[PDB]
Amino acid sequence: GSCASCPNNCENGLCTNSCDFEDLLSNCESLKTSAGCKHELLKTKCQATCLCEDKIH
């Protein structure tokens, strides 16, 4: 059924995960405040926290 491939994310039957980036480190949100997503370091392991955000406005 719908949401079958993404039961934890379904705004209306569609998955909400469209980010092609992933945070290699779980401290990306923490490193961002201590560094910055624009920072080159976050640009390699925190590409999703900088280039994406699990949510695009």
XYZ file of N, CA and C in Angstrom:
171
model
N 0.860 -1.218 0.000
C 0.000 0.000 0.000
C 0.883 1.251 0.000
N 0.283 2.409 0.043
C 1.084 3.666 0.050
C 1.876 3.758 1.357
N 2.883 4.589 1.397
C 3.691 4.725 2.641
C 4.335 3.378 2.982
N 4.107 2.380 2.173
C 4.703 1.042 2.453
C 6.231 1.131 2.402
N 6.768 1.942 1.530
C 8.252 2.057 1.445
C 8.746 3.124 2.429
N 7.863 3.950 2.923
C 8.286 5.002 3.892
C 7.152 5.261 4.886
N 6.793 4.263 5.652
C 5.700 4.374 6.662
C 5.982 5.449 7.715
N 7.225 5.792 7.911
C 7.560 6.824 8.931
C 7.531 8.221 8.297
N 7.191 8.317 7.041
C 7.146 9.658 6.387
C 6.105 9.652 5.264
N 4.975 10.264 5.490
C 3.923 10.302 4.434
C 3.074 11.561 4.605
N 3.471 12.645 3.996
C 2.681 13.900 4.131
C 1.283 13.677 3.549
N 1.195 12.921 2.491
C -0.128 12.645 1.864
C -0.012 11.385 1.008
N 0.709 10.408 1.485
C 0.884 9.156 0.702
C 2.233 9.211 -0.017
N 2.893 10.336 0.046
C 4.217 10.473 -0.620
C 5.316 10.528 0.442
N 6.441 9.922 0.181
C 7.544 9.952 1.181
C 8.062 11.387 1.304
N 8.502 11.779 2.468
C 9.008 13.168 2.640
C 10.537 13.184 2.557
N 11.141 12.077 2.223
C 12.630 12.042 2.137
C 13.068 12.260 0.686
N 13.332 13.484 0.315
C 13.772 13.769 -1.081
C 15.217 14.273 -1.066
N 15.836 14.294 0.082
C 17.238 14.787 0.165
C 18.202 13.744 -0.403
N 19.105 14.167 -1.245
C 20.090 13.218 -1.830
C 21.360 13.238 -0.979
N 21.315 13.901 0.147
C 22.518 13.974 1.022
C 22.243 13.305 2.365
N 23.279 12.882 3.031
C 23.103 12.233 4.354
C 24.193 12.734 5.304
N 23.876 12.917 6.554
C 24.906 13.403 7.511
C 25.787 12.235 7.947
N 27.013 12.221 7.508
C 27.927 11.119 7.902
C 28.107 11.139 9.422
N 27.994 12.294 10.022
C 28.146 12.389 11.501
C 26.806 12.789 12.124
N 26.493 12.264 13.278
C 25.202 12.623 13.931
C 25.359 13.951 14.669
N 26.525 14.530 14.618
C 26.747 15.825 15.315
C 26.715 16.968 14.300
N 26.235 16.710 13.116
C 26.189 17.781 12.084
C 25.432 18.995 12.614
N 24.294 18.794 13.215
C 23.547 19.959 13.751
C 24.421 20.622 14.816
N 25.109 19.824 15.588
C 26.001 20.376 16.645
C 27.224 21.039 16.002
N 27.799 20.413 15.010
C 28.996 21.010 14.348
C 28.604 22.304 13.636
N 27.415 22.357 13.105
C 26.971 23.581 12.384
C 27.054 24.793 13.308
N 26.481 24.702 14.471
C 26.535 25.851 15.410
C 27.988 26.096 15.823
N 28.769 25.055 15.920
C 30.196 25.228 16.314
C 31.022 25.599 15.081
N 30.487 25.383 13.910
C 31.239 25.726 12.670
C 30.312 26.454 11.697
N 29.558 25.719 10.929
C 28.632 26.356 9.955
C 28.417 25.407 8.780
N 27.195 25.230 8.362
C 26.929 24.315 7.220
C 27.711 24.796 5.998
N 27.786 26.083 5.798
C 28.553 26.610 4.635
C 30.005 26.142 4.752
N 30.442 25.863 5.950
C 31.846 25.410 6.154
C 32.157 24.248 5.208
N 33.376 24.163 4.745
C 33.752 23.065 3.811
C 33.683 21.712 4.526
N 34.081 21.657 5.769
C 34.044 20.358 6.501
C 32.618 19.811 6.511
N 31.662 20.622 6.861
C 30.255 20.143 6.869
C 29.849 19.816 5.437
N 30.537 20.393 4.498
C 30.217 20.153 3.069
C 30.654 18.745 2.644
N 31.293 17.994 3.509
C 31.737 16.626 3.096
C 31.050 15.539 3.942
N 30.793 15.786 5.204
C 30.105 14.744 6.036
C 28.732 15.270 6.463
N 28.554 16.566 6.453
C 27.240 17.150 6.846
C 26.566 17.727 5.605
N 26.831 17.142 4.475
C 26.235 17.639 3.205
C 24.713 17.749 3.329
N 24.084 16.844 4.022
C 22.602 16.921 4.159
C 22.224 18.046 5.122
N 22.987 18.234 6.159
C 22.662 19.314 7.128
C 22.886 20.678 6.464
N 23.777 20.744 5.513
C 24.048 22.040 4.822
C 23.300 22.087 3.488
N 23.660 21.236 2.572
C 22.992 21.230 1.242
C 21.505 20.889 1.397
N 21.162 20.056 2.345
C 19.727 19.701 2.539
C 19.319 20.003 3.981
N 18.262 19.397 4.441
C 17.801 19.643 5.834
C 16.621 18.717 6.132
N 16.605 17.553 5.542
C 15.471 16.620 5.787
C 14.161 17.356 5.498
N 14.254 18.592 5.087
C 13.030 19.382 4.787
C 13.402 20.579 3.910
N 12.788 20.702 2.765
C 13.107 21.850 1.873
C 11.932 22.830 1.876
N 12.198 24.091 2.086
C 11.095 25.093 2.108
C 10.926 25.704 0.715
